[PDB]
Every structure is written in structure tokens, then in C-alpha cells.
Amino acid sequence: TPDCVTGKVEYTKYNDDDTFTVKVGDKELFTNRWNLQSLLLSAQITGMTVTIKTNACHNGGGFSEVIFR
Amino acid sequence: TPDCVTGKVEYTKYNDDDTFTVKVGDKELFTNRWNLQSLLLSAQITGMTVTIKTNACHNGGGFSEVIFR
Amino acid sequence: TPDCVTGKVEYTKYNDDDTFTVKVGDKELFTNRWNLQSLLLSAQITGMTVTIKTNACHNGGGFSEVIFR
Amino acid sequence: TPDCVTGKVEYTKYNDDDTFTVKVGDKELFTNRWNLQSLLLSAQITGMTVTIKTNACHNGGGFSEVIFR
Amino acid sequence: TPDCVTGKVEYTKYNDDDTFTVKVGDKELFTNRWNLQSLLLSAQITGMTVTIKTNACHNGGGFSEVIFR
Amino acid sequence: TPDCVTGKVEYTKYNDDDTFTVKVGDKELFTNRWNLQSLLLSAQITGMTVTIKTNACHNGGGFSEVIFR
Amino acid sequence: TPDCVTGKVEYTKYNDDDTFTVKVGDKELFTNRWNLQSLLLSAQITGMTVTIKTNACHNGGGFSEVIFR
Amino acid sequence: TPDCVTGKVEYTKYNDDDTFTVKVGDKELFTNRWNLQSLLLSAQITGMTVTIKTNACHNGGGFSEVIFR
Amino acid sequence: TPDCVTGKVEYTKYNDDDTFTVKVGDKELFTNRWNLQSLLLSAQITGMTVTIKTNACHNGGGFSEVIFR
Amino acid sequence: TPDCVTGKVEYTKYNDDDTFTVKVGDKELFTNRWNLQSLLLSAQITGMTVTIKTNACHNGGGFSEVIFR
Numbered sequence: 001t002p003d004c005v006t007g008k009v010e011y012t013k014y015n016d017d018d019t020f021t022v023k024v025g026d027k028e029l030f031t032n033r034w035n036l037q038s039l040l041l042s043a044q045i046t047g048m049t050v051t052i053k054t055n056a057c058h059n060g061g062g063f064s065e066v067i068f069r
Numbered sequence: 070t071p072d073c074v075t076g077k078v079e080y081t082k083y084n085d086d087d088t089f090t091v092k093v094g095d096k097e098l099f100t101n102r103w104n105l106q107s108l109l110l111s112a113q114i115t116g117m118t119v120t121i122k123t124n125a126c127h128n129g130g131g132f133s134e135v136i137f138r
Numbered sequence: 139t140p141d142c143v144t145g146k147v148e149y150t151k152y153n154d155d156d157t158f159t160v161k162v163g164d165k166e167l168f169t170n171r172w173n174l175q176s177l178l179l180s181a182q183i184t185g186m187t188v189t190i191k192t193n194a195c196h197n198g199g200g201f202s203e204v205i206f207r
Numbered sequence: 208t209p210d211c212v213t214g215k216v217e218y219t220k221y222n223d224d225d226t227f228t229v230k231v232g233d234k235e236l237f238t239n240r241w242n243l244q245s246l247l248l249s250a251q252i253t254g255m256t257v258t259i260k261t262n263a264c265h266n267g268g269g270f271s272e273v274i275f276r
Numbered sequence: 277t278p279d280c281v282t283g284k285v286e287y288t289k290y291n292d293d294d295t296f297t298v299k300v301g302d303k304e305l306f307t308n309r310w311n312l313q314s315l316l317l318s319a320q321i322t323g324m325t326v327t328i329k330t331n332a333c334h335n336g337g338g339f340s341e342v343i344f345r
Numbered sequence: 346t347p348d349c350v351t352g353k354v355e356y357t358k359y360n361d362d363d364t365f366t367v368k369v370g371d372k373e374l375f376t377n378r379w380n381l382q383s384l385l386l387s388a389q390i391t392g393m394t395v396t397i398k399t400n401a402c403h404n405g406g407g408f409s410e411v412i413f414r
Numbered sequence: 415t416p417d418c419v420t421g422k423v424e425y426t427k428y429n430d431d432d433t434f435t436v437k438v439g440d441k442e443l444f445t446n447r448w449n450l451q452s453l454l455l456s457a458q459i460t461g462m463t464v465t466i467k468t469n470a471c472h473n474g475g476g477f478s479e480v481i482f483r
Numbered sequence: 484t485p486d487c488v489t490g491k492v493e494y495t496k497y498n499d500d501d502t503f504t505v506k507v508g509d510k511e512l513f514t515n516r517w518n519l520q521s522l523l524l525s526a527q528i529t530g531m532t533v534t535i536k537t538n539a540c541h542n543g544g545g546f547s548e549v550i551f552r
Numbered sequence: 553t554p555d556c557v558t559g560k561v562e563y564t565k566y567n568d569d570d571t572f573t574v575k576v577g578d579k580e581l582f583t584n585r586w587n588l589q590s591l592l593l594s595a596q597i598t599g600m601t602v603t604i605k606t607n608a609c610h611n612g613g614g615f616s617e618v619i620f621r
Numbered sequence: 622t623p624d625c626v627t628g629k630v631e632y633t634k635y636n637d638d639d640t641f642t643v644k645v646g647d648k649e650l651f652t653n654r655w656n657l658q659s660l661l662l663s664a665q666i667t668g669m670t671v672t673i674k675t676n677a678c679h680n681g682g683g684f685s686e687v688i689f690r
């Protein structure tokens with residue numbers, strides 16, 4: 001899967017349908033994987049650099065693959 | 070969903086029915102989403118600014134949408 | 139539910155029946171709510187002030203309501 | 208010295224003259240005590256509730272007394 | 277249940293059968309309680325003093341009771 | 346020097362004369378040692394148990410000796 | 415099970431099939447144990463030294479045993 | 484003083500002349516204020532959003548004013 | 553300088569003469585280096601393993617060399 | 622100044638002459654800058670990746686320039 005955006009987490013959002021949205025770089029993306037909710041908030045809280053990989057690389061696109069550095 | 074309150078978490082409360090209450094700004098609101106319990110306590114512990122979005126924007130009103138900054 | 143004790147968590151204990159015991163102020167109380175186990179240890183670790191509300195306000199009494207400040 | 212404001216630290220600012228500004232509640236106040244710079248940032252980072260005591264309780268007023276809870 | 281060992285967590289280990297091993301003092305003990313896995317790692321990470329209570333107080337013995345201080 | 350109070354830090358206060366006040370157990374004590382200011386706030390933030398040793402064991406009394414556990 | 419690699423976690427990755435990949439030393443390894451996802455991210459965040467034990471000690475190999483120091 | 488850049492700290496650098504460099508947004512700026520060295524590293528470590536204010540808003544420019552949010 | 557003790561910090565103590573005492577393993581040792589006071593408390597708070605090197609390897613002996621792992 | 626080593630901090634050491642030694646990658650290097658002592662321990666504690674720049678790129682060599690990521 002190709003890299004979409006790399007950077008620090010600007011903000012995260014819990015959605016009404018239980019999905020989770022994250023804003024990294026200039027993209028707002030969402031994921032339906034429940035395990036990723038606490039992992040991404042932890043990366044936000046500790047200033048980690050994350051790389052999100054997805055073919056739906058556009059605002060509102062979904063993802064499941066993330067690299068935490 | 071419209072913004073209701075934005076601010077730091079003043080306190081949180083675990084309820085007898087397993088719901089979770091949060092006090093942000095001048096509103097006390099609750100949520101029945103289990104995943105949000107640890108996320109909101111983490112935001113409280115790290116001084117994050119949260120925005121709660123809900124149509125029931127009054128004391129005792131419920132919510133499911135939160136932005137963590 | 140009336141306030142029972144307010145203070146910092148002195149210690150916590152995982153029990154053989156999977157319940158969790160907490161010592162706050164001069165009372166040792168237990169809870170059978172699984173979600174509260176990590177929330178109370180987090181409050182212990184970060185020096186939070188907690189208020190436990192219960193009608194069984196005596197050593198060995200149970201509770202489910204807690205306010206985290 | 209009378210209480211001026213109580214609340215969580217909204218933001219802090221390092222000034223050109225080496226003083227430190229803090230925004231708590233609806234007041235922006237500054238202090239010239241060097242030691243308080245790291246203590247206030249730590250309170251900001253850990254979501255502590257602080258009470259600033261000063262007779263110059265107005266925007267731009269200075270202070271030296273702070274209670275950390 | 278009698279005290280077995282008291283001290284800081286030296287190391288922890290995730291086992292192939294999903295049990296968790298902990299080394300406290302001069303004993304290596306394991307537990308099959310899933311909830312204790314994150315609680316013990318948190319105690320390890322924050323330098324907490326733990327007391328493990330078990331009748332199988334020998335290397336390889338199991339436990340379920342732990343006091344976190 | 347005899348033990349005065351043992352417990353968790355309830356609150357700390359920076360004073361106008363640059364001394365630091367701490368409330369542990371039922372005593373409010375102060376210290377004029379600059380180094381202790383960040384050490385005591387760190388103990389407050391991490392829920393450490395501290396023992397303050399002083400012959401002036403009364404409200405307003407001073408101290409310089411502290412054990413961090 | 416023999417030791418494969420010992421060192422600090424260089425990065426972690428959540429995969430599309432819900433497995434988790436970790437880079438320690440010169441090896442990229444994955445695990446299908448859900449519990450290990452938050453434990454390994456916590457070790458990454460706190461600079462812990464980990465030892466991964468596996469017979470598939472090569473890039474892409476899987477593991478279930480980890481020692482956290 | 485006008486805002487120059489707002490964002491998360493991408494990296495920091497200790498220089499041979501004892502000044503400190505920070506990369507925020509698309510600018511690499513330095514400061515000669517010793518107190519700011521630990522404050523900026525703490526903001527980096529906790530993922531804070533900072534605004535640097537300076538008239539020398541270009542790579543290599545210096546600053547002394549920072550807002551920590 | 554030969555190794556004296558290796559282990560986790562059991563407790564630390566600020567002394568009346570401004571020296572700092574640490575208990576590691578079965579030895580209580582002190583140091584007069586001011587910089588080491590916050591470094592050792594940080595190692596205590598984060599459960600680090602420290603090795604103290606000193607020729608005065610006995611209770612009450614002094615040291616200046618410490619390895620933090 | 623050319624890069625010497627990049628990696629996570631393996632261990633740090635306080636020396637008898639008040640200098641500070643750090644082991645990154647395959648090199649043990651020291652610095653005489655007092656400010657860097659707490660900054661490097663913080664990077665060790667939070668698993669940061671550091672790049673040390675120095676012309677004395679060999680065991681025992683000194684440095685003053687470090688990039689914290």
C-alpha cells in the first residue's frame with residue numbers, strides 16, 4: 001500500500017458510527033479498526049511521527065495501515 | 070453535529086449504569102460509548118482541549134462525538 | 139448516591155475473583171466493574187483525587203461510582 | 208493575598224524580557240520568578256488545577272503566588 | 277493468601293500460551309488473568325512496588341493476586 | 346531528625362518570598378531549599394509517598410529533609 | 415524458544431489483516447496476538463529494551479514471545 | 484511581535500555555541516535563551532502546539548517569544 | 553571505578569546538608585553532586601535500572617558515578 | 622559538523638569530572654555541556670531518536686551537537 005501522509009497527529013475525532021478520524025498533514029482520514037483508537041491517541045499525546053498508508057488518499061478516505069515512529 | 074462545548078476536562082465520572090460523565094466548560098454530559106471512557110480520562114490526564122459535538126447540548130445531555138486537540 | 143470517601147488512591151489490589159480493591163482515605167472498598175480497573179490504576183499513577191460514592195460505605199463494601207478530579 | 212483565578216492552564220508564553228505569561232480562566236497574568244516557568248509548564252502538561260493569588264487581578268497583572276492541585 | 281514477594285518489577289514476559297510472566301524479587305511467576313497484563317506492565321513502567329500473593333511461591337508458580345503501591 | 350508526616354502530596358504552593366509550601370497528611374509545611382521545589386512537584390504529579398522529617402512538626406513549620414518512595 | 419533480537423523498538427506498524435509488525439535491531443517481525451499491540455507500543459514510547467524470542471528469526475517471521483526490560 | 488510559525492515541534496538541536504534550534508512548520512529557528520531549551524524539548528515530547536513570534540521569520544532567524552498550547 | 557550496586561531505586565532522600573541519598577539493592581549511598589538529584593529522581597520515577605560505581609561501597613559511602621539503563 | 626551516529630540512547634553515565642557519557646549506536650561519547658545532561662536523559666526515557674554530530678567520531682570522543690527527533 002502506498003504512503004499517503006507522514007507527520008504528527010494534529011487532532012483525532014471519535015465519530016457517531018464508532019469510527020475514528022485523524023488529521024495528519026493536510027488530510028483528514030478515518031479508520032474502522034477499533035484497536036487503532038487508543039494507539040493513535042497515544043501517538044498524538046506523545047508527539048510521535050506517523051505514516052498512514054492507503055489507496056484512498058483524499059479527505060474522508062479510509063485506512064487501516066499506520067507506521068508509528 | 071453542532072459544537073456544544075470546547076475546553077479542558079474539569080472532571081469525569083463512572084456511573085452505576087456503566088455510562089461515563091464528563092464536565093467540560095459549563096456542561097455536564099454523558100456518553101454510553103465504552104471506548105470513550107479511557108480516551109476521555111487520557112485527555113483529562115494530559116490537559117488536552119476537547120470539543121464535544123451534540124444536539125443535546127444541556128446538562129445531562131448525551132454525546133458520542135468528540136474532537137481531541 | 140452519597141459520597142463515601144474523597145482522597146488520593148493509597149493502593150489498589152487485583153483479587154482472585156477478578157474484582158478490584160482500592161484504598162482511599164480510611165476505607166478499603168471493592169468494585170466488580172472491569173472497566174474501572176485500568177481507570178483507577180491510572181488515577182493512582184497520576185496522583186488524581188477521587189471521590190467514591192456508595193451506600194456500602196464501610197471496609198469491604200462495594201462501589202461502582204467514582205469521580206476523577 | 209486574595210485569590211484571583213482558579214482553573215486549568217489554557218496556555219503559557221515566554222516573553223522577550225524573560226518573564227512568563229499564563230492564561231488561567233479569563234485572565235492573562237505574568238510572573239518574573241524564573242523558578243515558576245518550569246513548574247507552570249508542568250502543571251499545563253499534566254492538567255493540574257492552579258489558583259493564582261495576586262492583588263493585580265486584571266489582564267497584564269503580575270503574580271508570584273500559585274497553588275498547584 | 278500469603279505474601280510471596282514484594283518489590284519492583286524486574287521484567288515481564290508474554291508467553292506463547294498467552295499467559296504473562298513477571299520477575300519480582302528472586303521469583304519468576306506467571307498469571308493467566310488477561311487483565312493483569314497491562315496493569316503489570318504499567319507498574320513496571322512507573323516503578324511501582326508490587327506485592328504478589330500466592331501459595332505457589334516458587335519459580336514457575338502461578339498467581340492472581342497483586343497489590344500495587 | 347524525627348518523622349513528622351508521611352503521605353501523598355495534597356497540594357504545593359509557591360510563596361512570595363520564594364519558599365515552597367507543601368501539604369502532606371494534616372500538616373502544611375514550608376522549605377527554603379530551591380532544589381526541592383521541582384522534586385516535590387514531581388512527587389505530587391506522580392503520586393509518590395513522601396515522608397517529611399522535621400523538629401518543627403506543626404503547621405507553618407519548616408523542613409529540609411524528605412524521603413521519596 | 416531461542417532469542418532472535420534484543421534492542422529498542424525502532425518502529426511499529428498496524429497491518430491490514432490486524433496483525434502488528436515491529437522493527438527491533440535488524441529484523442522486522444510480526445505477531446498475531448492482539449494483546450501485544452498496546453504492550454509493544456508502550457515499550458516503544460518508554461524506550462524499553464525488548465527481547466523477541468522466535469524460531470522464525472528472519473524478516474517477515476512471526477513471534478508471540480517477548481521479554482520487556 | 485508578529486506570529487511566524489505555528490505547529491508541532493518537528494525536531495530540536497543543541498548547537499556548539501550553546502544556542503538551541505527548533506524546526507516548526509517550514510522554518511528552522513534558533514534562540515539564545517537558556518530557559519527555553521527544556522521548555523521546548525518538553526513541548527516536543529508531549530506533542531504541544533507552539534507558536535513562535537519573531538520579526539526574523541526566515542530559516543536561521545532568531546526568536547525569544549513562544550506560546551505553548 | 554568498580555561497580556558497587558546495580559538495581560532499581562528503592563527510595564531517595566534529600567538531606568539537611570543538601571546532599572542526596574539513594575537506596576539501591578542493599579546499600580544506602582549519598583552524593584554531593586547537585587545535577588544528580590533530578591536525574592536520580594527521574595530514574596526512580598521511570599523504573600530505570602542503575603549501576604552506581606564507587607570505592608566506598610558500604611552504607612553511608614559516597615559516589616559520583618552512575619550508569620542509567 | 623558531520624553526523625557521527627544516529628539511534629536510540631542505549632545508556633547514559635554521569636562521570637566523576639561532571640561530564641556526561643552517552644552510548645548511541647556503536648559509539649560511547651561524552652559531553653561537557655551541563656544543559657545536555659537532562660535533555661539526553663529525557664531522550665533516553667522517551668525513546669527519542671538522536672543524531673550526534675562530532676568530528677571526534679570514535680569511542681571516548683567528545684561532542685556538543687545533538688539533534689532530537
Ligand SMILES: CCNC(=O)OCCNC(=O)OCCO[C@H]1[C@H](O[C@H]2[C@H](O)[C@@H](O)[C@H](O)O[C@@H]2CO)O[C@H](CO)[C@H](O[C@H]2O[C@H](CO)[C@H](O)[C@H](O)[C@H]2O)[C@@H]1O
Binds near residue numbers: 033063
Ligand atoms: C475489514 C473489512 N473492511 C470493511 O468493511 O471496510 C469497509 C469500509 N471500506 C470502504 O469504505 O472501502 C471503500 C474503498 O476504500 C478503501 C480502499 O479500497 C481500495 C482498494 O483497496 C483497491 O483495491 C481499489 O482499487 O480501490 C479502492 C478504493 O481506493 O482501500 C483503502 C486501503 O488502501 C481503505 O481500506 C482500508 O481502510 C478501511 C477503513 O478503515 C477498511 O478498514 C479496509 O478494510 C482497509 O483495507 C479504503 O477505505
Ligand SMILES: CCNC(=O)OCCNC(=O)OCCO[C@H]1[C@H](O[C@H]2[C@H](O)[C@@H](O)[C@H](O)O[C@@H]2CO)O[C@H](CO)[C@H](O[C@H]2O[C@H](CO)[C@H](O)[C@H](O)[C@H]2O)[C@@H]1O
Binds near residue numbers: 123125
Ligand atoms: C447507538 C446507541 N444509541 C442509543 O441507544 O442511544 C440511546 C441514548 N440516547 C438518548 O438518550 O437519546 C436521547 C435523545 O438524545 C440524543 C440526541 O438525539 C437528537 C437526535 O439526534 C436529533 O435528530 C433530534 O432532532 O433531537 C434529538 C434530541 O436532541 O442526539 C445527541 C447527539 O447529537 C445524543 O446522541 C448521541 O449520544 C448518545 C449517548 O452517548 C448515543 O450514543 C447516541 O447514539 C448518540 O448519537 C443524545 O443522547
Ligand SMILES: CCNC(=O)OCCNC(=O)OCCO[C@H]1[C@H](O[C@H]2[C@H](O)[C@@H](O)[C@H](O)O[C@@H]2CO)O[C@H](CO)[C@H](O[C@H]2O[C@H](CO)[C@H](O)[C@H](O)[C@H]2O)[C@@H]1O
Binds near residue numbers: 085169171201202
Ligand atoms: C449490576 C451487577 N450487580 C451485581 O451483581 O452486584 C453484586 C455485588 N453487589 C453486592 O454485593 O451488593 C451487596 C449490597 O451492596 C451494594 C449496595 O447496595 C445497597 C442498595 O443500593 C441500597 O438500596 C440498600 O438500601 O442497601 C444496600 C446495601 O448497602 O449499593 C452500593 C452502591 O451504593 C454497592 O453497589 C455497587 O457496587 C457493586 C460492586 O461493585 C455493584 O457494582 C453494584 O451494581 C453497584 O450498585 C454495594 O455493593
Ligand SMILES: CCNC(=O)OCCNC(=O)OCCO[C@H]1[C@H](O[C@H]2[C@H](O)[C@@H](O)[C@H](O)O[C@@H]2CO)O[C@H](CO)[C@H](O[C@H]2O[C@H](CO)[C@H](O)[C@H](O)[C@H]2O)[C@@H]1O
Binds near residue numbers: 262263268271
Ligand atoms: C522581587 C521584587 N519584585 C519586583 O521587582 O517586582 C517588580 C514587578 N512588579 C510590579 O510590576 O509591581 C507593580 C505593582 O503590581 C504588583 C502588585 O502590587 C500591588 C501591591 O501588592 C499592593 O499592596 C498595592 O496596594 O497595590 C499594588 C499595585 O497593584 O502586587 C501583586 C501581588 O499581589 C503583583 O506582585 C507580584 O508579582 C510581581 C511580578 O511577578 C513580583 O514578583 C512581585 O514581587 C510580586 O509581589 C503585581 O506585580
Ligand SMILES: CCNC(=O)OCCNC(=O)OCCO[C@H]1[C@H](O[C@H]2[C@H](O)[C@@H](O)[C@H](O)O[C@@H]2CO)O[C@H](CO)[C@H](O[C@H]2O[C@H](CO)[C@H](O)[C@H](O)[C@H]2O)[C@@H]1O
Binds near residue numbers: 309329331
Ligand atoms: C480461573 C480458574 N483457574 C484455573 O484455571 O487455574 C489453572 C492454572 N492454575 C494452576 O496451574 O493451578 C495449579 C496449582 O497452583 C495454584 C495454587 O494452588 C494451590 C492452592 O491454592 C492450595 O489451596 C493447595 O493446597 O495447593 C495448590 C498447589 O500449590 O494456588 C495459587 C494461588 O495461591 C495459584 O493459583 C492462582 O493463579 C493461577 C494462575 O494465574 C490461577 O489464576 C488460579 O485461579 C489462581 O488462584 C497457583 O497457580
Ligand SMILES: CCNC(=O)OCCNC(=O)OCCO[C@H]1[C@H](O[C@H]2[C@H](O)[C@@H](O)[C@H](O)O[C@@H]2CO)O[C@H](CO)[C@H](O[C@H]2O[C@H](CO)[C@H](O)[C@H](O)[C@H]2O)[C@@H]1O
Binds near residue numbers: 376377401406407
Ligand atoms: C541552612 C539555612 N538555614 C536557614 O537560613 O534556615 C532559616 C529558616 N529557618 C527557620 O525558620 O528556623 C526556625 C527554627 O526551625 C527549624 C527547626 O529548628 C529546630 C532545631 O533544629 C532544634 O535543634 C531546636 O531544638 O528546635 C528548633 C525549632 O524547632 O529545625 C527544623 C528541622 O528539624 C527546620 O529547619 C529546616 O528547615 C528550614 C526551612 O526549610 C531550613 O532549611 C533549615 O536549615 C532546616 O534545618 C525548622 O525550620
Ligand SMILES: CCNC(=O)OCCNC(=O)OCCO[C@H]1[C@H](O[C@H]2[C@H](O)[C@@H](O)[C@H](O)O[C@@H]2CO)O[C@H](CO)[C@H](O[C@H]2O[C@H](CO)[C@H](O)[C@H](O)[C@H]2O)[C@@H]1O
Binds near residue numbers: 415444447467468478
Ligand atoms: C495461535 C495459533 N497460531 C496460529 O494460528 O499461528 C498462525 C501464524 N503462524 C505462522 O504463520 O506459522 C508459520 C511458521 O512460523 C512460526 C514458527 O514455526 C516454527 C515452529 O516453531 C518449529 O517447531 C518448526 O520446526 O518450524 C516452524 C517454522 O518456522 O514458530 C515461531 C515461534 O517460534 C512463530 O510462531 C509464533 O508466532 C505466530 C505469529 O504471531 C503465532 O502466534 C504462533 O502461534 C507462535 O508460536 C512463527 O510464526
Ligand SMILES: CCNC(=O)OCCNC(=O)OCCO[C@H]1[C@H](O[C@H]2[C@H](O)[C@@H](O)[C@H](O)O[C@@H]2CO)O[C@H](CO)[C@H](O[C@H]2O[C@H](CO)[C@H](O)[C@H](O)[C@H]2O)[C@@H]1O
Binds near residue numbers: 539544
Ligand atoms: C538578550 C539580548 N539579545 C541579544 O544579545 O541578541 C543577540 C542575538 N540577536 C540577533 O542576532 O539579532 C539579529 C537581528 O535579529 C533579531 C530580530 O531583530 C529585528 C528587530 O526586532 C527589528 O526591530 C529590526 O527592524 O530588524 C531586526 C532584524 O531582524 O528580532 C527578532 C525578534 O523579533 C530576533 O530577536 C530575538 O531573538 C534573539 C535570539 O534568541 C535574541 O534573544 C533577541 O533578544 C530577541 O529579541 C532576531 O534574533
Ligand SMILES: CCNC(=O)OCCNC(=O)OCCO[C@H]1[C@H](O[C@H]2[C@H](O)[C@@H](O)[C@H](O)O[C@@H]2CO)O[C@H](CO)[C@H](O[C@H]2O[C@H](CO)[C@H](O)[C@H](O)[C@H]2O)[C@@H]1O
Binds near residue numbers: 582584585613615
Ligand atoms: C569534587 C568534590 N569532592 C569532595 O569534596 O568530596 C568530598 C566528599 N568525599 C568524601 O567524603 O570522601 C571520602 C572518601 O570517600 C570517597 C572515595 O574515596 C576513595 C578514593 O577515591 C580512593 O583513591 C581511596 O583509595 O579510597 C577512598 C575511600 O574509599 O571515592 C568514592 C568514589 O570511588 C567516593 O567519592 C566520590 O563521591 C563523593 C561524594 O559524592 C565526591 O563526589 C567525590 O568527588 C567522588 O569521587 C567517596 O565519597
Ligand SMILES: CCNC(=O)OCCNC(=O)OCCO[C@H]1[C@H](O[C@H]2[C@H](O)[C@@H](O)[C@H](O)O[C@@H]2CO)O[C@H](CO)[C@H](O[C@H]2O[C@H](CO)[C@H](O)[C@H](O)[C@H]2O)[C@@H]1O
Binds near residue numbers: 654675677682
Ligand atoms: C567550550 C570549550 N570547549 C572545551 O573546553 O572543550 C575541551 C574538551 N575538548 C576536547 O577534549 O577537545 C579535543 C578535540 O576534540 C573535539 C573536536 O575537535 C576537533 C576540532 O573541532 C577540529 O577543528 C580539528 O580539526 O579536530 C579536532 C579533533 O577532532 O571537536 C568535536 C566537535 O566536532 C568535539 O568538541 C565538542 O565537544 C567537546 C566536549 O563536549 C567540547 O564541548 C567542544 O567545545 C565541542 O566543540 C571534540 O571534543
